Symmetry: D2
């Protein structure tokens, strides 16, 4: 009878709410957020800026991340087997190439059709290791719309509201009008927004890792490619070039990984950079008719098929995501934030842990 | 060189920004807001919920409100003579009727074509006083779109951003990324949202006055009607029924005046109440074919032409709007908020005062 | 059951089809047409070019036209009383002014709220007679869409097909594939296209009267105005200026009456003419903010609210419409064409006569 | 100064008009047609019903058809090299399978990347010959829109008009109003409509070959497949199953070849037939997630991605297309009609001959 709040309507909050409602049928759940999946794109809302591909960054020794990523893959892949592309999922061969390293992450061996490839067969030079396996991409707008429909069907009440502090959920008459009584519990799925909701030491742990992408219309591309330069360093370190094709024919090209960079608007030079690198790792990203042209001329061909530029801020945190049980303003609090560049590939895993902590 | 911030992209912020940029051509102006005019309607954003009509509530002794309301009428009426309905304005005869009173507000005598009518000619019973005069309605979405285009043309930079505190404008890296240097000044045009930005005693002076409206498609209606019940009490007291026709053929029917009511969703019984009262004061709101039908059948005819239901929170303030110079967080601050049910009819007057205070 | 063909999907064909299906006479109805109401506007398809208003041209001594026009008025007015504007109908006050004449048609006295006005109160000069009465306008696209839905609901089969001759309905495999069996009957509701379907010496009787109109967005205008110059001459003679407001806020301004003029495209000078004459007869057609300006500036204000120019060819015929039973190409034939500038205002009346002729 | 008429705005008329205006810049050209490319689909207008692919039917000894087909290929391929998919063209690998034949048409060897394949590798049974080569598909609505824009830019006047007889062009006031003076010449590109415009011996040569197609949304398919059953017989004989993918992700599945069948509406049993046969010759037409399912479940999966059913009448003629100079009703007449199922793959070839015959 006392309301349970899910604060956040990104992929993290919506998956949390789905698992919450499935575990406790008819529970009194209110989802509050100041940005919703179908809103216009905004650099501050990470979930619809994402590619998204399932391409784990889980260190061999990071048992929690490996578990989350593979659990999430299992859920998404079973869903694709059931409904195909209806919710924005597309199974595909993912190819990862390393420019330095002579190993892949052990976590990839859990995916179907894992193969070690000859690094000399990469289209770009200096590739020292190369693997492929079956994975999935997600058109986030489509998938999030499906999650929104699902939480409605499960009986969640949805509210557009800004929450200035966790205490406000108990005290602010504007918020109390939504759910009548002070909440018994809150799931804090506020992404990078959690910086304004937690005490100073925890707030300090959050930082943006800015990512710019270029979305092209390239429906000929139905395979995934990533080039990793530099060590992950047990986290999400180094830089990536990637080709992330969606089932709708939009293909996300990236990326950048700028720690502490709060600039929300795309940079012209980075557009050029992304297009140039995308052509290096995946020559077939070019419009078919332009593929025989000098490499320099193919950038303009890619420009001609650009759908949009986009920028987002990965909600980065030292040690990865905070999924933990605490207390604030007399409410039971479950934190589920700080997923960096891996929220889409870990969402269902985190959601299940979060609900288990609450329960 | 130092940025000047306009916080808010409602009618108050946008008129403030226009007058600011007109007074000081090429100034470094950045407009920050978490809700913009063309966004989907939300009860928290009053400017696009409003009717809006110019129907002053200024008490005979309220010299400041009278001056603002008359100034705003002059600006809007001048604009209508220059551009017609291009920006959402429509000149019309406004008829006001009182159920109890035997006097009107002196301020109305400043409008063109002021006439005292025979109250016995009102279509509803118990009317003791009635006047008409030339006034204007505004389709707020259209007018705000023109204001947005105008501030762009004048060189303002526009940002979608939430401001958690005034200090954050100078200290918060997420906001500093927008304009680089710490701002010298901020115009706080945050509407009811100002309650999160000011000290608790100022925040306590602000309260919502909830208003529900029904929008109908009634392009045959090109005249305005209001019935006042109870005393204004030197502010915006009592209750009103109104018919507010827009140039686009949508006609806003209302209303309610629920002080402290934070419920953002429409109430079914209130829909019935509004349609019933609308028919009382203006029989011609009914579709022409339905005008000879019994009263109950005519409510049904109005239901058949409903476009939308909407709810908004008027940013009411004890003593009316705060338009004042101050200092806070190392900035020169001009507050311009708390216009209640009168922001549209006072906007330009208030904007000119705000810019003068800053200058 | 042998097919019964309605040839034409203008207002005449569709009303004929509705009345045919409503007759419940076991008719296996196939509606064939090379232009359908929701198709792009084309000067050759009169029904969606029309204003349309109900403003009878029926001469005092033209009993058939008077009966048709008043019957159609009753049907449309009752429809408006039942459903309001849902099917594109709008009741309004129609004001007619004459430049020269000292009387009105008797037929108008049958409308609600009839009155003879003081012609000195007309906004333009040289007005010698003026009346008003309650009438209706029709947004033809909306009303025709409603008729199309209605014939579908009643079980008619609808086909996009060009009929090269009446005989072809029985003999042409391209047409026979639509309905399998040779048709027993055809209602020829082909409008000006009937010139290619009726025996050739009857075709000389049909001619275009070209009409250009300017459609403006003027939702403040919900009253109708017409000025008649010259005599009707027992038919549709002389020239008219008119303001015909639709329920959707589009207002049709006109008009021209160019006999034998087959030019399907709007003329620049005619746009200027129509706007100028519209302002003469109805000063409030101008945008409210423009009403105090010089006449030339008001013409410019009208140009600023133009939605579209359009041209149509009225299916004119000496003697008015042919509504008649015949036998041709082995089939029972009912002709229902040649309604000139009055198809909308006579449609239901004609449809009922046509169906009665077939039913025998 | 005397008008030149192009009668018809299908692919044949519009290519003729383009070549006409390019040869004689500023010429007084009027294009008359009762159906235009952007009109709603109609079984009587073949050009937008077509797949279309470039898959020649030209007999080894049919010099004219081979010349036409290869010239048209050259023109379209050059266009695709210049603009890619901008005008609806997509280069692809076309694979043809024969159920009986042990040879391919010689004309195919003129296409790039020609190769004879192992017929054992066909996914369906009883294949005895198989080849592939580079060819093109066309999204006809997009291509015809480009042609329409081209003729406008070259100064053609376009008219929606029905021509009851060629004599009417000189004598009918309804047609004379379009171009003022009796025309000097007419290019008769009326497709199957030519049967109403030519003398009884020439009209008897024309007949419909009805084809029904199913359009699916299958953007994973960018390769073309055809199975030929029975002999071409020096013409377009026998029956074909085909997969014709467009650049916009629509894929046309077919077909039927019913001579003299004037039924313009799709048959339910033919939908089933086409879907079943498409799956036989190209298992990858099925949604990726459905590819391991039993055959009946895959047919159902194809039904779920259906965009539209369509029917058209190929303008078939004894001896193929009539491209011929004549004199009728006072005019210099060039006939260019009766292209059967090969109008798209022969259009530019025929157009050029037609303009030459007139010049
Ligand atoms: C360019 C780019 C590419 C990426 N690609 C991938 C990829 O391929 N695979 C992958 O797994 N991940 C990827 N990511 C990362 C992924 O997008 C994020 O980890 C994930 O979206 C974070 O989800 P979230 O729900 O925590 O945050 P968000 O999506 O930002 O949502 C937070 C929610 O909380 C609400 N909120 C916050 N504060 C408040 C408040 N005070 N009051 C009310 N509401 C509040 C917001 O309105 C919003 O609804 C990418 C990120 C970027 C930027
Ligand atoms: C039903 C109804 C009918 C009405 N009818 C009339 C009428 O007929 N005539 C009339 O004169 N008035 C009318 N009003 C009143 C009028 O709508 C308000 O007085 C006026 O819109 C207030 O404008 P504003 O710009 O102050 O507030 P708002 O429109 O609410 O805009 C405030 C802006 O501040 C931004 N903001 C606030 N806090 C923050 C933050 N922390 N960070 C970033 N951005 C922030 C918001 O995003 C928004 O852009 C009506 C009101 C209602 C509810
Ligand atoms: C500018 C203008 C204003 C007007 N204003 C008014 C007004 O205010 N009030 C009023 O009452 N009337 C008005 N009219 C007149 C009215 O529009 C016509 O009288 C009426 O539309 C004629 O209807 P119809 O069905 O006979 O002809 P059409 O609407 O032309 O329809 C004829 C049908 O026959 C079909 N057809 C013809 N030949 C063939 C063939 N060979 N094969 C297959 N199909 C064929 C066509 O495709 C079409 O479906 C106006 C006309 C014009 C031009
Ligand atoms: C199902 C199907 C699949 C096909 N697939 C292919 C393929 O893959 N490759 C290929 O090469 N071909 C294909 N075709 C064949 C191709 O569609 C035709 O050969 C080609 O479209 C014929 O073009 P057209 O311009 O002659 O005829 P149409 O496109 O029918 O155009 C005739 C034009 O003449 C006009 N017209 C006719 N009579 C008159 C008149 N009396 N007055 C005014 N205007 C008139 C019409 O309005 C129209 O504008 C296919 C056909 C079908 C039915
Ligand atoms: F906040
Ligand atoms: F014809």
């Amino acid at each position: 009878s006392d309301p349970i709040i899910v604060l956040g309507a990104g992929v993290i909050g919506l998956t949390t709410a789905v698992r919450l409602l499935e575990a406790h049928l008819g529970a009194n759940v209110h989802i509050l957020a100041d940005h919703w999946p179908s809103d216009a794109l905004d650099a501050q809302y990470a979930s619809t800026i994402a590619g998204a591909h399932h391409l784990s960054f889980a260190d061999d020794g990071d048992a929690r991340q490996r578990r989350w990523d593979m659990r999430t893959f299992d859920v998404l892949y079973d869903e694709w087997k059931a409904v195909g592309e209806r919710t924005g999922l597309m199974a595909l061969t993912q190819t990862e190439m390393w420019e330095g390293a002579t190993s892949h992450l052990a976590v990839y061996e859990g995916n179907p059709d894992f193969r070690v490839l000859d690094p000399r067969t990469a289209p770009c030079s200096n590739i020292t290791h190369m693997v492929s396996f079956t994975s999935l991409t997600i058109a986030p707008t489509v998938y999030l719309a499906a999650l929104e429909a699902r939480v409605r069907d499960l009986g969640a009440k949805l509210h557009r509201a800004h929450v200035p502090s966790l205490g406000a959920l108990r005290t602010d008459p504007a918020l109390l009008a939504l759910y009548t009584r002070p909440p018994a519990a809150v799931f804090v799925c506020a992404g990078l927004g959690a910086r304004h909701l937690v005490p100073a030491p925890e707030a300090a742990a959050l930082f943006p890792t800015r990512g710019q992408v270029v979305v092209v219309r390239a429906p000929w591309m139905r395979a995934g490619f990533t080039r990793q330069v530099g060590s992950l360093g047990g986290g999400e370190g180094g830089t990536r070039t990637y080709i992330i094709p969606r089932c709708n024919g939009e293909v996300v090209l990236g990326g950048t990984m700028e720690q502490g960079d709060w600039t929300p608007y795309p940079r012209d030079e980075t557009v050029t950079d992304i297009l140039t690198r995308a052509l290096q790792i995946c020559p077939d990203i070019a419009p078919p008719y332009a593929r025989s042209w000098p490499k320099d001329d193919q950038v303009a061909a890619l420009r001609s098929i650009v759908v949009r530029d986009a920028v987002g801020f990965r909600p980065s945190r030292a040690g990865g995501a905070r999924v933990a049980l605490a207390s604030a303003a007399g409410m039971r609090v479950v934190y589920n934030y700080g997923h960096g560049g891996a929220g889409w590939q870990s969402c269902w895993g985190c959601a299940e842990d979060a609900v288990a902590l609450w329960a």
